[PDB]
């Protein structure tokens, strides 16, 4: 109506009703003095024919039709019916399970201790002796009393008087410290577990309390003590039920007879536990079975079965859908349906860079000259932090085991872990100190692990900090040919098998084997639920009938194209060759390959695999790969006569060469040990950057599973042992440092003498020793990437040289050599064989899917 | 209304009266399509 | 069809 | 919350020459 | 801008004109009234992990984002602002002793309650008062001992201003909303109740 | 000892005629959520008996 | 403290309800009353839009 | 028209850079103190000295 | 209290011209609020 | 290159105007300033360049510690005496 | 005790410019004026304090 | 040590002349030396643009 | 009670 009209409510524009030459005097000028903010244009929604006018339903639920539980799945089928008028995106068909997962008794969620915690750590809760302790006065107690009458005890007072009941020392007193008041001649006391009772360390001690006023009391109730020269002070006491959800006794000192006991040795030592956020797996990874040919899925239509979805065993396609949100996406921001976390390792305690410790000024003590006492504030939080979040998760040797204390035999069992611990005599302040380089040790483990990583910790808090846990979960559909497909109106059955295995679907930190500790249990439930769209039905018919001819039909393509291939490596050897019957290539876009140990992939099909006993951040699925800096140099040769990317387009002609160490006449490029004519190719192939300037990747392009997020150059320098004449190699159980403020070999206590030291040839001070250095550059994160172009550099999506006469004219075989430096504990090689993976469908009968599938290279 | 001193929570249940009515029918093989009116305090924006 | 009203076209 | 906002036909840094905040230099 | 209890909202009824309900046509899930938090009652329907209703949560990711009829996605940064729903959402949980499932669900109320005794002062901020004893407080919840547990979430949604846009997809098209449109043409009056 | 009631503006068009009536909180159920725990009745139920 | 809902995010029960913006690590209320700096007696200056 | 421009003056910017003419600022929380995340203290053992006690200086 | 003010200087050429049709009624300028609304407030009890 | 003469101008305009207030009444719990805006002629003021400039001494009250600690005897415990 | 505000303003890396434009702004390069003193073979003297 | 008007944002003084990238917490060189390693007599392979 | 000094920390 007018008056809406004339204010520019609805209708005419600020480009339209203006006249048409002062429109132009804000175009002229925009940059300066810019008015068309000043000015208005009614921006109006659609009046009709989209919307729904009758009762539609957005947010249509579903529940299974037809059920199926195996020892090891979970097998749901709905009979998920559009309807007629109307159009559905898979995009928004979620799934919605609902169960009881009971973490097992490994998560300890919380770091540190908790229980207790202040502690003066090692130490011992008023105990007594055995043998017939009735012989020597102790003397350590709280409550400053006044006559204890006994047969009753203490006191208080009411008028009339007021012997106690059952004397509390939730702390008491002494409230008037300065002067501590001071042994009121009079008799004065606090409480006394005795023997009989676990003596453990006071730390980590719980103990069900069951007076309800918070008294400890063993059930049938107990106390009382003093003698009758005559009363002085008197201590109840008991047989509470101590425990210690968090803890691991280090020095436990023998005499392992005679436990609940004493005789000081029992008074210990103790420690945390150690952390492992124990939960769900972000991209709710496994709760479906994807890629797997038994167990696989259908969505066809009541009215052919004629599926929908044929999955080859070979394209991960989970890790797609962790990549395909790599794109389209910012994984640094936790979503919460859809579980979206991503892992991470704080990227400080993977490149490690020794900074030192300020501190510059006497951290100095002062009780309640003046007497005192210091402590390194500032480096003491070093050791904690050194001997805590790296070290401790260093390998799997170089920990050593308590003494007088057993470890359970099956190695990666969670009471085996928390039972050894590391040394921080290496490994700590004194190592490597002032360099950025990552310790060599954990090189090439995992450093996904770490209890101070984000991602790993929105989802065990996510699901709070209990071992039950009734969950309440979405899983998106994740298969690249359903996830963004539009049906038509029709009944279509929609079918899935989840798995319920706790190692699979369950990431744990630390790797101690879930499937052994304990673990998930129902699907109590699991319905659909897809938000339909109140489109309204006149122009739904018509978007359901032209989405229904055939010249017009759907197309998605996996955003990982992917052949994936696993290819076993001994337990230390290198190049890995492979060989490829004759065949053809007519659009092969680049190889993509990277390293996985074993014991984190499993077999792929069956489900249940038993020797598949690891539980962190499986690099096959989550898309985290951290063995990227242990190749050496790859091979690519076709028929068994010519290089490949040759031509003598690179340097070293054949063998795109990855690191090359020592031997550098002169390539290695970055000050690292890349190749000059890698970083080229890398660099050239995912930014396409490289020949034509080396710039920073700009950002849009350096989205985190890709390579500048990454290249960690690092180097160090340490002592050229066949130069300084004294490269005495003092073994680490020898170095006496920190002479003994610190520890003994093992994280114990204050044993020391003082003396200088042994730490580390000092490579940076007027007398240094010598040195030599080396260089590494950790990748993780990613996968190198080797596109088929004739240019390295990537114009489209099919390569340059993909369609290519010779390479799709006819066949030909591939014979390619890695080389890979050794690894301990037998590794696996993975590599993708990127290929265009489209799909069509088609559907023109009113409630059926004709789908048609193809992969150019590897179409098997 | 002037309800008598009851003693606890009591909700008068006033029952406004209309025109309930329904005209499903059956065009086709399987189409049920009926409006649902009540007038008097209806159901329409 | 409608009982509201009998009126109908292709598209 | 609402933006509309109006001057959109385009712009113009006309040509014969080109475009303003230098593309490259301080 | 700051808001601080956008959380304790649970449930509105949008009722125009004494008896047609907004968005009825059961054109939600419960149509008859949005359900921002069902507190206990699940049936299957929170989202998120949070108390959120799935079907309030679809309100507010179509009302900033015009998302949810396409697959849920993390809504792009240039559309998410600090005063928008998703950059604060923050579903929490946890679960404690349950009521009578424990031996002892046995009531140790604050004063009375013994932990890191002996080194922190007594209720408050004063130091060195009593021995060291073991300790009785958070009664346990993770190892072997763990108490069986009774699982609590909730959502903290602060500076969000909860919307309920007005087109009938509610889906932000235009301004001038697609039934901020049509109730002209049927120009008459509503006076609307809500609750 | 009151219900001060009110409806604004309507289009009364064929209203045939009240009908008052008195039901009792606990026992009349809660109205059509679900599981209402608030209902702790199992007497009859005027609203729907 | 410490051992009071350890292993969770979630904020005590008790604060939910209570402002979170008045901490006396609120960025901009820090910023604005450190700006003018710590005067108790403050000769200020202003611009207003 | 006293929060609008802190609404208005949210999508053409970012209100969270410091622009002290007109003193913006915008009322902000530490998140580790409003949504608490007590993942625990790291501690092994924090050790004391004469010029020998102990702290879990790291709680 | 002082009000300031900023006038970019301007073609006095170009000036008029930009004045001879901002002032014609058909080039008029129109604002909103951002949050453009009413804010009808409304009590609730103590605990209720 | 620039756009020349045609949009700039060498007359003498000016770019900070102060205008000092015309008329200053005042209460208890308010405050009302009243200027006469003149914006010349042949210039064009935009509102958003506008901005009131207020000046004065400000008392933060006995409440108003702006430090989580003591800058006084600190680094002491927390007891003490003489 | 009584407060006299002092009041800086660092301000590092970077250098204050002073374009030499009429609308001492930005609207390209061979700024405005500049264009002027160009073909003119004319001559002039600096000398800034 | 720590009283400097504490509860005022102020660049010191004495120092706020001095030069502020000599400072021992300064990213850019930090890294740069690190990046050479941790010692001395460091052998160096680098590229300049 | 349970012999003490203090060193102050976030100081």
């Excluded at chain 1, 997962?101 to 300890?108: H, N, T, V, W």
């Excluded at chain 1, 309640?368 to 390998?395: C, H, Q």
Aim: aromatic share 12%; net charge neutral.
């Amino acid at each position: 109506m007018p008056q809406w009209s004339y204010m520019h409510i609805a209708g005419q524009d600020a480009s339209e009703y203006l006249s048409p030459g002062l429109v132009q005097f804000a175009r002229a000028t925009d940059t300066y003095f810019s008015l068309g903010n000043k000015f208005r244009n009614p921006t109006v929604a659609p009046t009709h024919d989209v919307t729904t006018d009758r009762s539609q339903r957005l947010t249509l639920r579903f529940v299974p039709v037809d059920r199926e539980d195996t020892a090891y799945s979970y097998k749901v089928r709905f009979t998920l019916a559009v309807g007629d008028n109307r159009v559905l995106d898979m995009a928004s068909t979620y799934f919605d399970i609902r169960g009881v997962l009971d973490r097992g008794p490994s998560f300890k969620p919380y770091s540190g201790t908790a229980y207790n915690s202040l502690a003066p750590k090692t130490a011992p809760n008023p105990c007594e002796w055995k043998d017939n302790n009735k012989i020597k006065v102790r003397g350590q107690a709280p409550f400053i009393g006044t006559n204890i009458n006994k047969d009753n005890g203490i006191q208080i007072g009411t008028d009339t008087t007021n012997q106690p009941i059952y004397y509390q020392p939730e702390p008491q007193v002494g409230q008037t410290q300065w002067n501590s008041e001071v042994g009121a001649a009079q008799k004065v006391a606090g409480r006394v577990l005795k023997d009989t009772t676990p003596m453990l360390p006071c730390y980590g001690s719980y103990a069900k309390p069951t007076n309800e006023k918070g008294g400890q009391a063993s059930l049938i109730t107990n106390g009382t003590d003093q003698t009758l020269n005559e009363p002085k002070a008197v201590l109840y006491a008991e047989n509470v039920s101590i425990e210690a959800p968090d803890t691991h006794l280090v020095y436990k000192p023998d005499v392992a007879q005679g436990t609940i006991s004493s005789a000081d040795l029992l008074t210990q030592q103790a420690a945390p536990n150690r952390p492992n956020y124990i939960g769900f797996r972000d991209n709710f990874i496994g709760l479906m079975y994807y890629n797997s040919t038994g167990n696989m899925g259908v969505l066809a239509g009541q009215a052919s079965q004629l599926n929908a979805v044929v999955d080859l065993q070979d394209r991960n396609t989970e890790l797609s859908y962790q990549l395909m949100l790599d794109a389209l996406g910012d994984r640094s921001r936790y979503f919460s349906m859809w579980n979206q976390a991503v892992d991470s390792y704080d990227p400080d305690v993977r490149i490690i860079e020794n900074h030192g410790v300020e501190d510059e000024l006497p951290n100095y003590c002062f009780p309640l000259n003046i007497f005192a006492m210091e402590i390194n504030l500032a480096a003491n939080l070093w050791r904690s932090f050194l001997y805590s979040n790296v070290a401790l998760y260093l390998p799997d040797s170089y920990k050593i085991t308590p003494d007088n204390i057993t470890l359970p035999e099956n190695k990666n069992t969670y009471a085996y872990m928390n039972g050894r611990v590391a040394v921080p005599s290496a490994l700590d302040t004194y190592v490597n100190i002032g360099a950025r380089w990552s310790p060599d040790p954990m090189d090439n483990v995992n450093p996904f692990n770490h209890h101070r990583n984000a991602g790993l910790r929105y989802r065990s808090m996510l699901l709070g900090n209990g071992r039950y846990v009734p969950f309440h979960i979405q899983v998106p559909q994740k298969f690249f040919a359903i996830k963004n497909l539009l049906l038509l109106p029709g009944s279509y059955t929609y079918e899935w098998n989840f798995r319920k295995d706790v190692n699979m679907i369950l990431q744990s930190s630390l790797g101690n084997d879930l499937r052994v500790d304990g673990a998930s249990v129902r699907f109590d439930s699991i319905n659909l639920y897809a938000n339909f769209f109140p489109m309204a039905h006149n122009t739904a018919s018509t978007l359901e009938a032209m989405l229904r001819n055939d010249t017009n039909d759907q197309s998605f393509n996996d955003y990982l194209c992917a052949a994936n291939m696993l290819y076993p490596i001994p337990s230390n050897a290198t190049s890995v060759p492979i060989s490829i019957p004759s065949r053809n290539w007519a659009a092969f876009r680049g190889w993509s390959f990277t390293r996985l140990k074993t014991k984190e992939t499993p077999s792929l099909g069956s489900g249940f695999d038993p020797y598949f006993t690891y539980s962190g951040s499986v690099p096959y699925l989550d898309g985290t790969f951290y063995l990227n800096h242990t190749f050496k140099k790859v091979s690519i040769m076709f028929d068994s006569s010519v290089s490949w990317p040759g031509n003598d387009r690179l340097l070293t002609p054949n063998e795109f060469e990855i690191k090359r160490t020592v031997d550098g006449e002169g390539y290695n490029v970055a000050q690292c040990n890349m190749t000059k004519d890698w970083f080229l190719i890398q660099m050239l192939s995912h930014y396409n950057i490289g020949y034509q300037g080396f710039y920073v990747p700009e950002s849009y392009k350096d989205r985190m599973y890709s390579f500048f997020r990454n290249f960690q150059p690092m180097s160090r320098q340490v002592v050229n042992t066949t130069t300084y004449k004294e490269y005495q190699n003092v073994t680490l159980p020898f170095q006496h440092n920190n002479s003994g403020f610190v520890g003994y070999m093992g994280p114990t206590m204050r044993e020391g003498q003082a003396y200088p030291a042994n730490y580390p040839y000092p490579l940076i001070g007027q007398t240094a020793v010598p040195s030599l250095t080396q260089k590494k550059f950790l990748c993780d994160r990613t996968m190198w990437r080797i596109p088929f172009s004739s240019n390295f550099m990537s114009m489209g999506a099919l390569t340059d040289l993909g369609q290519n006469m010779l390479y799709a004219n006819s066949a030909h075989a591939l014979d390619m050599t890695f080389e890979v430096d050794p690894m301990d504990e037998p590794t696996l090689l993975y590599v993708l064989f990127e290929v265009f993976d489209v799909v069509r469908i088609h559907q023109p009968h009113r409630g059926v899917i004709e789908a048609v599938y193809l992969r150019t290279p590897f179409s098997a | 209304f002037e309800v008598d001193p009851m003693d606890e929570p009591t909700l008068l249940y006033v029952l406004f009266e209309v025109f309930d009515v329904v005209r499903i029918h059956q065009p086709h093989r399987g189409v049920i399509e009926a409006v649902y009116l009540r007038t008097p305090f209806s159901a329409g924006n | 069809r409608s009982s509201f009203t009998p009126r109908q076209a292709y598209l | 919350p609402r933006h509309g906002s109006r001057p959109f036909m385009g712009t113009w840094n006309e040509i014969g020459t080109s475009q303003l905040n230098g593309g490259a230099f301080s």
